[PDB]
Design a protein around this ligand. Structure first.
Ligand SMILES: [Mg+2]
Ligand SMILES: [Mg+2]
Ligand SMILES: [Mg+2]
Ligand SMILES: [Zn+2]
Lengths: 295, 41, 289, 246, 148, 153, 166, 110
C-alpha cells in the first residue's frame, strides 16, 4: 500500500483514540467503587473512586507524592496493574516499588518497558525507503544482562551491521525520547480491532493471533506512549522518565529457514537504582554477549 | 525531579559488595600487570 | 478630631481615585453617560468632516442587526408591543455593502492610476490592507464612529465597526456626489499609508521568483547576484551587500546580516524599483481638482 | 516595661447565668419532630398508579384518630383551616423557599422556613452557588398525618402537618471557585420526601413554616460526587499495633 | 522633569491636516451654578459668548448645565477619546473665552514633554548614510592585503 | 594545631572527661544499651571495646579486677561483667558494640545523638539499616555477573 | 491590627462557563502571634517557596529551626482545610505559591547592663502567611543560555536609532 | 568601635539574603519501608526507634520491679518472653521476664 510512515502513525493513533472513546462511552455514568489499601504502610485506608476513570496513580496522589515518586506497580488484589490503567470494580491495592522484598514483577515491567522503548527507537531510526518490521519482545529473565527486541530489516540491509557510531546514535535517540515524559497507556482491546490496528506487520499479526488463542475471550493488551503503539504482555511502568541510564548494547543477527532477524540487546537502569560508572561499564560488557531465551 | 544522592554502596546487597570489591581488585591487578612490560609492546 | 470638611471631601476624592485605580470599571457607553444628545452628535459628526450628509441616511447607517436583535429580545422579555416602530429600523446591510463595493473600486482605481506598474495581486493586497479590520477600526475610533454606532457589546468588535464605517461611507455616497465620496476616501484611508512600505502589507514569499517573473515580462533575461561590499566574515555579526546585475548593469543593491538575507533584500529593492513604490517616489497628491 | 497581652477569646458557660435570665428565651418552634411518620415500603410501586395511591392516601388520613383529633384541635384553635387547600400552599412555600435559598435571600428564607430548618439548609451551602429550578410535579403533594404538641407549662400548642411530596427537580451545586461540584443543571431528577410544617396556634400571626424533611429509609442513594474521596484510616501510636477487621 | 514624567513623540491623530483638517474637539460640557458667586464668569460667558462660539465652530457639541455646585467646571472630550477637565472657578469672561479657544485649538493629546520638535516619515530621501556610501570600490573587491 | 590527636575535650578537663566516660560505661554495662551524645558515644566505644578485652583476661587477673573496680562505679556490675559479658564474648574478636546515630533530641538544644548497644543483649533489636535484597534489578544483574565469572572458571 | 489574609479565603467566584479551563483552587492561611523571630521565620518561608507541599513538609520535619514545627503544623492545617472545606481532590497536588513572614505587636522590657544603664528589649512576635494552589508545582527558571544572551544582544543592537539626528 | 553611618536596606538585603545564610535543601530524605514515615538515609527511623524505646522501657521497668534493690543485679543472662510462650532448653537456667503483652512482629524469638 502507498502509505507514508507518518500517515500510518496517524491512522494507528486515530484508531486507538476511537477504541478509547468507545471504551469510555461503554460506561455512561460514574459509579463509585470502594477500594481498600492493603499496603504495609497504611492499612485500612479507603478510597472512593470513579469506575473506569480513577487510576492507581490517582490513588497514589490521594495518599502522598512519595507514593507517586516511588511506587511503580500496583497489585489489584490478585495481579499486577499499571498506574495508568483505570480500575474496574471494588478491590484492594498494594503498591510495589523497585526496592521491595520481592520486586520481580516490577523488574519484569521495567524490562518490558525498556524493550518497548528500544523497539520504538529502532522502528523510527531507519530510513523510509527501507522496510523495518518489529516481531515481538522476547521475555528474557532479569538474570540476563540485556533486554532483547526482534526486528526484521529490508533484504538489502542483511549485509551490514550497525557500528559503534550507529549504536551511539540509537542511544542518543533513546535518551532524547526519555528526556520528554511520555506516559504509558494500557488499553484492553480484541483481536478483531488489533488486526486492523496493525494491518501491516505479518509478524505482529501472528503475535496477536497467538496471544489471542490462549485467551478465550479474545482480549489483546495494547500499550501506547506518544505516537508508538505496540502489543506486550503484562503492565508497564507509568512514566518514561523513570529510565535514567539507557544504552543499546549490541545486535546479533540470527538466521532461520524463513527469515533472518536482528536481535537488539540493550541495557538500562532506573533513576532509583542507578549504579556507579565502573559498575555500569561491567554490566554493559556483560550485556554485549548473546542472550538466547525464548521458551 | 528532586533526585536524591546515591553512592555505590546504597543499592548493593550483602553478597554483592565483596563481589564488586573483588571484581575491581582483580581488574586493577590485571591492568597493572599488563603495563609491567612497556618496552616490548 | 480635626474640625473641617474640605480635607474630608478631598480625601474622599482621593479614595475614589484609589478605588478606580485598584478596580477598573468596564467601559460604558457614551450614550449611557449623562451628557448625550444623539441628534446633536449626528449633526456635529456631519459638520466636522466638511460634508453634507442626510440625517435619515446617517440614522439608517448607524443602526446594527445585533442592536435590533437585542432590542427585540428586550421587547419579548418585557411583554410590550414594538412591531410598529422597531421593525422599521431599516438595517444598514445595504448601505454597508454599497460602501464596501464603492470603496474597493475607488481604491483600486486610485492605485491603478497612481502606480500603473503594480500587479493585480499587489493592488488587491493594497486594497485589502486599506479595507482591513485594523485600519478601518482605527479610523472609526478616531472619528468617534464607535460612540455613535447603535450596537450592543460596547467594545463593538472589528466586524461591527467595519460594517458601521462602510455603512456611513455608503450613506455619504448616496447623499453627496461620487467625486466627494472619493475625496473623503482619499483623505481618510490613503493617508494611513503615509510612511508605509509595499511589502509590509503585501507579504510576499519569494521576492527572487517574483523579480525574475517581472523581468521575464519586461523582457529581461536574468538577474545575477554579486557581492559588492562586506564587513567581516568570521565575526559574530557579519554585514554583506549584494547587488543585482542584468547584462552586467546594477539595478539594485541590498544589505543584510547574511548573504541570503542580503540577496533577498536586494531582490525586494529591485522589485520596488520596478513597481515604482520607492522612498523617492512622488508624494500622494492632496488637492481639489 | 510592664505591659501584657489582652483579648484572650474563651467560651465558658455556666448554669447560674443561664438560670438567672430575667426573660425566658422565646421559641417560635419546637426542637425536632415528636411523632415521625413511618411510610410503608411499597410506596415506590404504589406511586406508579394514580387511584391506587390516592385512595390509600385518603383512607389513611381519615382512619387515624390522632390525625383527626389534631385537625379538630387546629380548627377549634384557629378558624378557616382547610385540609384540601393545604397542599397547594405547602407546594408554593417549598418552591419559594428553594428559590430564596437559590437567591441567597436570607430574610425571606427566615420568614418561610423555621429556626430548626434554616441552619440545616444554610450551613454547608452559604459559600457555594445553587442553581435549582422547578420543572414538573409527577404526583400532587398528599397530606399524610397531622400532629400537635401541647405544652401546658407555657400554654403553647405547636401543630405540625406531614405531607408526602413527589417532585421533579434539577439541582446544580457549584464551588466557590466557579467549578461544578455536585450535579448537572439540565437533569430533571425525581425525588420523594415528606415535608413536616410547623405553625404556632397560640400566636395570633402563626405563619406556616417548614420544620422537617423526612426521607424514607429505603430511598435510593443520592447521586455520586463528581470528585474522588479518600478516607484515612485510624492513626496509630508507635506502641499500638494495628488490628485488621474481618 | 523628563526623567520623572512620561514622554511622547510629535504625532498627529489620524494624519489630520494632510487631506483635510478636522477639529479634534468633540464635546464641551460646562457645569455651573446660578446662585454661587464663583459661577459669575461662567454665567456671563453663557449669556454672551457661547452662542457666537457655537456658530463659529459647529463641529463641537456644547452642553450647559446649571446645578447646585460650588466649583464651575468645563469638560472637553476629544475625538481621541481623551477627557480634559478644567476649572473656570472665578475667572473673567475674557479668560473663559481664551480657555475655550485654547481647548478648541488643542488636539487632545497628552500634555507631556515632546522628545523632538519635528516628525518626518521616511527622511532617507536620496539614500541614508552607511559606512560604505563614501568608500571607493577596488578592482575585483579585494581585501587590502588579499592576493588573488 | 590538633594534628595527631585521638582524645576529644569533654567536661571540665581530663579528669572530668574520665569521670563522664566512666559513668557512661557504668550505665552501658548496667542497661546493655544506652543513648547519649554522638561524640560521647563515639568516645565511649573504644573504652567499651577495651573493657570486654580486660574482662576476657579472667576473674583472677588483679589488673583487670582493679580496672573494673575503678571504672564500674556500681560494684554489683563487676561480677556481671566477669560472668555474663565476658563469657558470651569469646569467639568474637572486636565486634562487641554497635553504635547508631539517632535523630536529634526533641529538646531545644537539637544535639546530635547516638545509641550504643552490647551485641547479644536481651532487648528488642534496633531498626538496623538492612541492605537491599538480591531480587532487586541491580542485585540480580550483579548475580548474573557473578554466575558468568563462576562459569568462566 | 489588620486581618485580611483570613477574609481573602471567603471570596466567591461566579460559575465557570462550559468550555472554560478549570481554575485552580487557592487556599489562604495564616498563623498569628508566633513567638518566633521575623527574620528567622522569613528564612524558613523562603526555604519552601515554590516547592511542593510534601517536599516542604519533609524539609521542615528535619529542619532544626523552632519555627519549622510551626510552619509544618500550619501546612497540615491548610491541607486539611483545603480537603474538607474546599472542593480540592488529590491532597498531594498542592504547591506553595506564596510564603511570607511579618512582624506583629512586640513587648517592651528592661535589659540591665551595668553602672545603672539599661536598654529596651523587644519580645518579638511574627505572623506567617501561606498560599496553596492546586496543581503541579511550576518549573524552576533555568539560567539564561548563551543562545538567548546572543539573541538579546542582537536585538539590543538592532533596536538602536540615530539619536538627535533628524 | 561605633558605626559611622546607617546601613541601607539594599545593603542589609544583600548581606542577609546570600545563599551562604540561606537554608540549604537536604536531598537525603527518604521514607521508612516499615512504617512509611520520613527518615534520613544515614539515621535510624524515628518512629521505629520510638517503638523500640517504648518496648525497652517497659521491659526494663518490669526487670527492675523484679529486683527489689538498687544493687541487686542478675549474675546470669536474662530472657524476656511474652504471653503464650515457654522457656526452651537453651533459655532455661537464666533470669526470666514475663510480659502480658503479646510478642511484637519486629521482635524475633531467636
Ligand atoms: Mg546597682
Ligand atoms: Mg535604639
Ligand atoms: Mg531595638
Ligand atoms: Zn520506620
Amino acid at each position: 500500500s502507498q502509505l507514508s510512515p507518518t500517515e500510518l502513525i496517524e491512522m494507528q493513533n486515530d484508531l486507538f483514540n476511537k477504541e478509547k472513546n468507545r471504551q469510555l462511552s461503554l460506561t455512561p455514568r460514574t459509579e463509585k467503587i470502594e477500594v481498600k489499601h492493603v499496603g504495609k504502610t497504611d492499612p485500612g485506608t479507603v478510597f472512593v473512586m470513579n469506575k473506569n476513570i480513577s487510576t492507581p496513580y490517582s490513588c497514589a496522589m490521594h495518599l502522598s507524592e512519595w507514593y507517586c515518586r516511588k511506587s511503580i506497580l500496583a497489585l489489584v488484589d490478585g495481579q499486577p496493574w499499571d498506574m495508568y490503567k483505570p480500575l474496574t470494580k471494588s478491590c484492594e491495592i498494594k503498591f510495589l516499588t523497585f526496592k521491595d522484598d520481592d520486586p520481580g514483577e516490577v523488574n519484569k515491567a521495567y524490562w518490558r518497558s525498556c524493550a518497548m522503548m528500544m523497539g520504538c527507537v529502532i522502528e523510527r531510526a531507519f530510513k523510509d525507503e527501507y522496510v523495518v518490521s518489529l516481531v515481538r519482545a522476547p521475555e528474557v529473565p532479569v538474570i540476563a544482562g540485556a533486554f532483547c527486541y526482534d526486528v526484521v530489516l529490508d533484504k538489502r540491509l542483511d549485509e551490514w551491521m550497525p557500528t559503534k557510531e550507529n549504536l551511539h546514535s540509537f542511544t542518543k535517540d533513546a535518551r532524547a525520547l526519555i528526556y520528554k515524559d511520555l506516559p504509558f497507556e494500557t488499553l484492553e482491546v480484541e483481536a478483531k480491532v488489533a488486526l486492523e490496528i496493525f494491518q501491516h506487520n505479518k509478524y505482529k499479526l501472528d503475535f496477536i493471533e497467538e496471544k489471542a488463542s490462549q485467551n478465550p475471550e479474545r482480549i489483546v493488551k495494547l500499550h501506547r506512549f506518544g505516537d508508538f503503539i505496540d502489543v506486550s504482555e503484562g503492565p508497564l511502568i507509568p512514566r518514561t522518565s523513570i529510565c535514567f541510564q539507557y544504552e543499546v548494547s549490541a545486535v546479533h543477527n540470527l538466521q532461520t529457514q524463513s527469515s533472518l532477524v536482528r536481535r537488539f540487546q540493550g541495557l538500562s537502569l532506573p533513576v532509583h537504582l542507578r549504579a556507579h560508572f565502573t559498575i555500569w561499564n561491567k554490566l554493559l560488557e556483560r550485556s554485549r554477549k548473546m542472550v538466547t531465551e525464548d521458551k | 525531579h528532586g533526585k536524591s544522592v546515591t553512592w555505590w554502596d546504597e543499592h548493593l546487597s550483602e553478597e554483592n559488595v565483596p563481589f564488586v570489591k573483588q571484581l575491581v581488585s582483580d581488574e586493577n591487578k590485571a591492568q597493572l600487570a599488563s603495563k609491567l612490560c612497556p618496552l616490548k609492546d | 478630631a480635626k474640625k473641617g470638611f474640605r480635607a474630608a471631601y478631598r480625601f474622599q476624592k482621593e479614595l475614589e481615585r484609589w478605588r478606580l485605580l485598584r478596580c477598573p470599571p468596564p467601559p460604558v457607553r457614551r450614550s449611557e453617560k449623562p451628557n448625550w444628545d444623539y441628534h446633536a452628535e449626528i449633526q456635529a459628526f456631519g459638520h466636522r468632516l466638511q460634508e453634507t450628509f442626510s440625517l435619515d441616511l446617517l440614522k439608517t447607517a448607524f443602526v446594527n442587526s445585533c442592536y435590533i436583535k437585542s432590542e427585540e429580545a428586550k421587547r419579548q422579555k418585557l411583554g410590550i408591543d414594538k412591531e410598529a416602530a422597531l421593525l422599521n429600523l431599516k438595517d444598514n446591510q445595504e448601505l454597508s455593502e454599497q460602501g464596501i463595493s464603492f470603496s474597493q473600486t475607488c481604491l483600486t482605481q486610485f492605485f491603478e492610476d497612481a502606480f500603473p506598474d503594480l500587479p493585480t495581486e499587489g493592488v488587491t493586497s493594497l486594497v485589502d490592507f486599506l479595507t482591513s479590520e485594523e485600519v478601518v477600526c482605527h479610523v472609526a475610533r478616531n472619528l468617534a464612529v464607535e460612540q455613535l454606532a447603535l450596537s450592543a457589546e460596547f467594545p463593538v468588535p472589528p466586524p461591527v465597526l467595519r460594517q458601521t464605517f462602510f455603512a456611513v461611507i455608503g450613506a455619504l455616497l448616496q447623499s453627496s456626489g461620487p467625486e466627494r465620496t472619493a475625496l473623503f476616501i482619499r483623505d481618510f484611508l490613503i493617508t494611513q499609508m503615509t510612511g508605509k512600505e509595499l511589502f509590509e502589507m503585501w507579504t510576499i514569499t519569494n521576492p527572487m521568483g517574483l523579480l525574475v517573473e517581472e523581468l521575464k515580462k519586461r523582457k529581461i533575461s536574468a538577474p545575477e547576484s554579486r557581492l559588492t561590499r562586506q564587513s567581516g566574515s568570521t565575526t559574530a555579526l557579519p554585514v554583506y551587500f549584494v547587488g543585482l546585475y542584468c547584462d552586467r548593469k546594477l539595478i539594485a543593491e541590498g544589505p543584510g546580516e547574511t548573504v541570503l538575507v542580503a540577496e533577498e533584500e536586494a531582490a525586494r529593492v529591485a522589485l520596488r524599483k520596478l513597481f515604482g513604490f520607492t522612498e523617492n517616489r512622488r508624494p500622494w497628491d492632496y488637492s481639489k481638482p | 516595661s510592664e505591659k501584657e497581652f489582652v483579648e484572650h477569646a474563651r467560651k465558658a458557660g455556666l448554669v447560674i447565668p443561664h438560670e438567672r435570665l430575667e426573660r425566658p428565651i422565646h421559641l417560635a418552634c419546637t426542637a425536632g419532630i415528636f411523632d415521625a411518620y413511618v411510610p410503608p415500603e411499597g410506596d415506590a410501586r404504589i406511586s406508579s398508579l394514580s387511584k391506587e395511591g390516592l385512595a390509600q392516601r385518603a383512607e389513611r388520613l381519615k382512619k387515624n384518630v390522632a390525625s383527626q383529633l389534631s385537625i379538630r384541635k387546629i380548627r377549634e384553635s384557629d378558624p378557616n383551616f382547610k385540609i384540601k387547600d393545604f397542599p397547594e400552599k405547602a407546594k408554593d412555600i417549598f418552591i419559594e423557599a428553594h428559590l430564596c435559598l437559590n437567591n441567597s435571600d436570607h430574610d425571606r428564607l427566615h420568614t418561610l422556613v423555621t429556626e430548626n430548618c434554616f441552619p440545616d439548609m444554610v450551613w454547608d451551602i452559604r459559600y457555594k452557588t445553587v442553581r435549582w429550578s422547578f420543572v414538573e410535579s409527577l404526583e400532587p403533594p398528599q397530606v399524610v398525618q397531622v400532629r400537635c404538641s401541647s405544652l401546658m407549662n407555657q400554654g403553647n400548642i405547636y401543630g405540625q402537618v406531614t405531607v408526602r411530596m413527589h417532585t421533579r427537580q434539577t439541582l446544580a451545586i457549584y464551588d466557590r471557585f466557579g467549578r461544578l461540584m455536585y450535579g448537572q443543571e439540565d437533569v430533571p431528577r425525581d425525588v420523594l420526601e415528606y415535608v413536616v410544617f410547623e405553625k404556632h396556634l397560640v400566636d395570633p400571626y402563626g405563619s406556616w413554616r417548614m420544620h422537617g424533611k423526612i426521607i424514607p429509609p429505603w430511598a435510593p442513594p443520592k447521586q455520586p460526587i463528581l470528585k474522588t474521596v479518600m478516607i484515612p484510616g485510624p492513626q496509630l501510636k508507635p506502641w499500638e499495633e494495628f488490628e485488621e477487621p474481618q | 522633569t523628563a526623567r520623572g514624567t512620561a514622554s511622547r513623540f510629535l504625532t498627529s491623530v489620524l494624519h489630520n491636516g494632510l487631506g483635510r483638517y478636522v477639529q479634534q474637539l468633540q464635546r464641551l460640557s460646562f457645569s455651573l451654578s446660578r446662585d454661587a458667586p464663583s459661577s459669575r464668569g461662567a454665567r456671563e460667558f453663557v449669556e454672551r459668548e457661547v452662542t457666537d462660539f457655537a456658530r463659529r465652530n459647529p463641529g463641537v457639541v456644547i452642553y450647559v448645565n446649571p446645578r447646585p455646585c460650588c466649583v464651575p467646571r468645563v469638560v472637553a472630550e476629544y475625538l481621541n477619546g481623551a477627557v480634559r477637565e478644567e476649572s473656570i472657578h472665578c475667572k473673567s469672561v475674557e479668560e473663559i473665552a481664551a480657555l475655550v479657544q485654547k481647548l478648541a485649538d488643542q488636539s487632545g493629546l497628552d500634555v507631556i514633554r515632546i522628545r523632538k520638535p519635528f516628525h518626518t516619515d521616511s527622511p532617507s530621501i536620496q539614500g541614508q548614510w552607511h559606512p560604505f556610501t563614501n568608500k571607493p570600490t577596488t578592482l575585483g573587491g579585494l581585501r587590502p592585503r588579499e592576493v588573488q | 594545631i590538633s594534628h595527631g590527636r585521638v582524645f576529644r575535650r569533654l567536661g571540665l578537663g581530663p579528669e572530668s572527661r574520665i569521670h563522664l566516660l566512666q559513668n557512661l560505661l557504668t550505665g552501658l554495662v548496667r542497661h546493655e544499651r544506652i543513648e547519649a551524645s554522638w561524640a560521647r558515644v563515639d568516645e565511649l566505644r573504644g573504652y567499651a571495646e577495651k573493657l570486654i578485652d580486660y574482662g576476657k583476661l579472667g576473674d583472677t587477673n588483679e589488673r583487670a579486677m582493679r580496672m573494673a573496680d575503678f571504672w564500674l562505679t556500681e560494684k554489683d556490675l563487676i561480677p556481671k561483667l566477669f560472668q555474663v559479658l565476658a563469657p558470651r564474648f569469646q569467639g568474637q574478636n572486636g565486634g562487641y558494640t554497635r553504635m547508631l546515630q539517632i535523630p536529634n533530641r526533641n529538646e531545644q538544644d537539637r544535639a546530635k545523638m547516638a545509641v550504643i548497644e552490647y551485641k547479644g543483649n536481651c532487648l528488642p533489636p534496633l531498626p538496623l539499616p538492612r541492605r537491599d535484597s538480591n531480587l532487586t534489578l541491580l542485585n540480580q544483574l550483579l548475580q548474573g555477573l557473578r554466575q558468568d565469572q563462576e562459569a568462566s572458571s | 491590627i489588620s486581618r485580611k489574609w483570613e477574609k481573602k479565603n471567603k471570596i466567591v467566584y461566579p460559575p465557570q462557563l462550559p468550555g472554560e479551563p478549570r481554575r485552580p483552587a487557592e487556599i489562604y492561611h495564616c498563623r498569628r502571634q508566633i513567638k518566633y523571630s521575623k527574620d528567622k521565620m522569613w528564612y524558613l518561608a523562603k526555604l519552601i517557596r515554590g516547592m511542593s507541599i510534601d517536599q516542604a513538609l519533609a524539609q521542615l520535619e528535619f529542619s532544626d529551626k523552632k519555627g519549622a514545627q510551626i510552619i509544618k503544623e500550619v501546612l497540615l492545617e491548610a491541607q486539611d482545610m483545603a480537603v474538607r472545606d474546599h472542593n480540592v481532590e488529590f491532597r498531594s497536588n498542592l504547591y506553595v505559591a506564596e510564603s511570607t513572614s511579618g512582624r506583629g505587636q512586640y513587648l517592651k522590657r528592661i535589659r540591665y547592663h551595668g553602672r545603672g544603664r539599661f536598654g529596651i528589649m523587644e519580645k518579638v512576635f511574627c505572623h506567617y502567611f501561606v498560599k496553596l494552589v492546586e496543581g503541579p508545582p511550576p518549573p524552576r527558571e533555568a539560567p539564561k543560555t548563551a543562545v538567548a544572551h546572543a539573541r538579546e544582544y542582537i536585538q539590543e543592537l538592532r533596536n538602536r536609532t540615530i539619536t538627535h539626528a533628524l | 568601635a561605633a558605626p559611622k553611618n546607617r546601613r541601607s536596606i539594599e545593603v542589609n538585603r544583600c548581606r542577609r539574603r546570600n545563599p551562604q545564610k540561606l537554608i540549604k535543601v537536604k536531598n537525603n530524605i527518604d521514607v521508612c519501608p516499615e512504617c512509611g514515615h520520613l527518615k534520613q538515609k544515614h539515621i535510624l527511623c524515628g518512629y521505629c526507634y520510638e517503638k523500640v524505646r517504648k518496648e525497652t522501657a517497659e521491659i526494663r521497668r518490669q526487670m527492675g520491679k523484679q529486683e527489689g534493690g538498687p544493687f541487686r543485679a542478675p549474675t546470669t543472662e536474662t530472657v524476656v518472653l511474652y504471653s503464650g510462650e515457654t522457656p526452651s532448653e537453651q533459655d532455661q537456667g537464666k533470669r526470666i521476664i514475663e510480659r502480658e503483652r503479646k510478642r511484637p512482629s519486629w521482635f524475633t524469638q531467636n
